[PDB]
Write a protein that binds this ligand. Structure first.
Ligand SMILES: CC(C)[C@H](Nc1ncnc2[nH]ccc12)c1ccc2c(c1)S(=O)(=O)CCC2
Length: 167
């Protein structure tokens, strides 16, 4: 959990402009969060990047979990191996607003983080999931009580998020 160069927002929420994959290699976190979908198909974005960094081992393990347990629910999660990126990967399904899912489920999605003492995570439901990223940060700060290190891979968005928090 050797996090470096983060800006502390609250006593339990930190943020950095960085690729979560690059962070997981630098930090060696106990938990890395994946911004998953309900069938754990890691086809692009954050999930595709984390899977590629495991040379597809994450996808094979994910398909086996879905075979035995069935899909996740929106707002739910599961704990699987972290492979070479972390001890564990917490796969969390935030709502995809662009596909009609309820933004209120973003609180349930962040609540999964509270079962783990320290996490490296992306900004849930941002990017192509369509949630307003300033709203996602506000839900993160109001919901997560354990120690969360957010990696946001875009300097323009990072600057807007820090300026919004400090208003
Ligand atoms: C807002 C983006 C800059 C951010 N991208 C990232 N944030 C941190 N490490 C990253 N590695 C590669 C991309 C990447 C982001 C955060 C959350 C979501 C996505 C994107 S998505 O994949 O479009 C859909 C799922 C939710």
């Amino acid at each position: 959990n050797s996090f470096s160069g983060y800006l502390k927002l609250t006593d339990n929420v930190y943020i950095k402009n960085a690729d979560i994959v690059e962070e997981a290699k630098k930090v060696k976190p106990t938990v890395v969060v994946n911004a998953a979908n309900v069938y754990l198909k890691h086809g692009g974005g954050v999930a595709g990047a984390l899977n590629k960094a495991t040379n597809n081992a994450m996808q094979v393990e994910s398909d086996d979990y879905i075979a035995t347990n069935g899909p996740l629910k929106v707002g739910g999660s599961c704990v699987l191996s972290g492979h070479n990126l972390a001890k564990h990967c917490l796969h969390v399904v935030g709502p995809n607003v662009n596909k009609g899912e309820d933004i209120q489920l973003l609180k349930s999605a962040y609540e999964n983080f509270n079962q783990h003492e320290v996490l490296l995570a992306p900004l849930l439901s941002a990017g192509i999931f369509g949630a307003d990223p300033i709203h996602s940060l506000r839900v993160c700060v109001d919901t997560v009580r354990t120690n969360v290190y957010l990696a946001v891979f875009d300097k323009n968005l990072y600057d807007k998020l820090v300026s919004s928090f400090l208003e």
